Design a protein around this motif. Structure first.
Motif, PDB file in Angstrom:
ATOM      1  N   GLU A   1       0.906  -1.200  -0.059  1.00 55.86           N
ATOM      2  CA  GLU A   1       0.009   0.015   0.021  1.00 55.86           C
ATOM      3  C   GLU A   1       0.980   1.312   0.094  1.00 55.86           C
ATOM      4  N   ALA A   2       1.740   1.199   0.816  1.00 59.53           N
ATOM      5  CA  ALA A   2       2.808   2.384   0.882  1.00 59.53           C
ATOM      6  C   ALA A   2       3.480   2.617  -0.571  1.00 59.53           C
TER       7      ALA A   2
ATOM      8  N   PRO B   1      -5.892   9.194   2.089  1.00 61.53           N
ATOM      9  CA  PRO B   1      -7.120   9.037   2.849  1.00 61.53           C
ATOM     10  C   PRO B   1      -7.121   8.368   4.168  1.00 61.53           C
ATOM     11  N   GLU B   2      -6.377   7.111   3.997  1.00 63.88           N
ATOM     12  CA  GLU B   2      -6.116   6.294   4.997  1.00 63.88           C
ATOM     13  C   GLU B   2      -5.273   7.033   6.281  1.00 63.88           C
ATOM     14  N   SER B   3      -4.438   7.757   5.806  1.00 60.69           N
ATOM     15  CA  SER B   3      -3.831   8.758   7.038  1.00 60.69           C
ATOM     16  C   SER B   3      -4.824   9.622   7.752  1.00 60.69           C
TER      17      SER B   3
ATOM     18  N   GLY C   1      -6.961   7.904  10.185  1.00 56.03           N
ATOM     19  CA  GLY C   1      -6.602   7.187  11.345  1.00 56.03           C
ATOM     20  C   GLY C   1      -6.175   5.720  11.079  1.00 56.03           C
ATOM     21  N   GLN C   2      -6.662   5.253   9.777  1.00 58.62           N
ATOM     22  CA  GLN C   2      -6.619   3.632   9.505  1.00 58.62           C
ATOM     23  C   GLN C   2      -5.141   3.243   9.834  1.00 58.62           C
ATOM     24  N   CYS C   3      -3.995   4.302   9.179  1.00 54.62           N
ATOM     25  CA  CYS C   3      -2.522   3.990   9.534  1.00 54.62           C
ATOM     26  C   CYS C   3      -2.043   5.540   9.985  1.00 54.62           C
ATOM     27  N   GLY C   4      -0.828   5.320  10.547  1.00 56.81           N
ATOM     28  CA  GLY C   4       0.083   6.316  10.734  1.00 56.81           C
ATOM     29  C   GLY C   4       0.848   6.542   9.036  1.00 56.81           C
ATOM     30  N   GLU C   5       1.211   7.711   8.888  1.00 56.46           N
ATOM     31  CA  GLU C   5       1.938   8.022   7.684  1.00 56.46           C
ATOM     32  C   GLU C   5       3.003   9.094   7.733  1.00 56.46           C
ATOM     33  N   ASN C   6       4.349   8.808   7.334  1.00 58.43           N
ATOM     34  CA  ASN C   6       5.256   9.867   7.327  1.00 58.43           C
ATOM     35  C   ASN C   6       5.589   9.785   5.629  1.00 58.43           C
ATOM     36  N   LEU C   7       5.780  10.930   5.051  1.00 60.51           N
ATOM     37  CA  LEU C   7       6.289  11.308   3.857  1.00 60.51           C
ATOM     38  C   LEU C   7       7.587  11.931   3.913  1.00 60.51           C
ATOM     39  N   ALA C   8       8.502  11.553   2.659  1.00 57.19           N
ATOM     40  CA  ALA C   8       9.571  12.147   2.536  1.00 57.19           C
ATOM     41  C   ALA C   8      10.008  12.610   0.959  1.00 57.19           C
TER      42      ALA C   8
END
Ligand SMILES: O=P(O)(O)O[C@H]1[C@H](OP(=O)(O)O)[C@@H](OP(=O)(O)O)[C@H](OP(=O)(O)O)[C@@H](OP(=O)(O)O)[C@H]1OP(=O)(O)O
Length: 151
Positions: free
Chosen positions: A35-36, A53-55, A58-65
């Motif tokens: 998924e990521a 939308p998942e983030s 609150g379905q998952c946490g998410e970090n972007l870079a």
């Protein structure tokens, strides 16, 4: 394969830092990796950076870079952790300047996935996903889940 390598490097760095904070290791999860990676390809196609939308539910946490070049796993995890310099352990809670760090070390989080994709100009877009989701701002939760570093 380049993808396996990126996974190993990002996970090993997450777990070195979590051991410094006295919380249990993360494990990689096949479904979160897939998924990521899908999301990273969507971000790189448009060159847009925004949360999924998942983030946002609150379905998952998410970090972007992001970078203009193909980023190593160590470089991404070290950049996210470096946000600790802005975190005040005597004033626990979210700030945008510390949100990747607090998700990395969140005590209750157990699994993660990661993906990376290049854009047409060679820039690269990285997505990490975390489960259970961290960075929950309910009173007390940061104090319970984001612990100070021990040497
Ligand atoms: O796809 P297989 O031929 O069944 O080989 C798999 C596969 O290796 P590949 O990465 O080349 O597909 C797994 O890797 P992924 O599913 O992550 O891509 C790997 O798991 P590791 O990532 O830990 O190497 C797994 O090994 P294992 O079942 O021992 O965890 C290994 O299976 P075999 O090596 O036993 O054939």
């Amino acid at each position: 394969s380049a993808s396996k390598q990126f996974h190993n490097e990002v996970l090993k760095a997450h777990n070195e830092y979590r051991q410094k904070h006295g919380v249990p290791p993360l494990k990689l999860c096949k479904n979160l990796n897939r998924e990521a990676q899908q999301y990273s390809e969507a971000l790189a196609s448009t060159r847009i950076l925004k949360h999924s939308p998942e983030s946002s539910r609150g379905q998952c946490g998410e970090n972007l870079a992001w970078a203009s070049y193909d980023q190593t796993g160590k470089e991404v995890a070290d950049r996210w952790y470096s946000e600790i310099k802005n975190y005040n352990f005597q004033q626990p809670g979210f700030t945008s300047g510390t949100g990747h760090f607090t998700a990395m070390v969140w005590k209750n989080t157990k699994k993660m996935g990661v993906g990376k994709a290049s854009a047409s100009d060679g820039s690269s877009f990285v997505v990490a996903r975390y489960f259970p989701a961290g960075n929950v701002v309910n009173e007390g939760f940061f104090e319970e889940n984001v612990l100070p570093p021990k040497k």
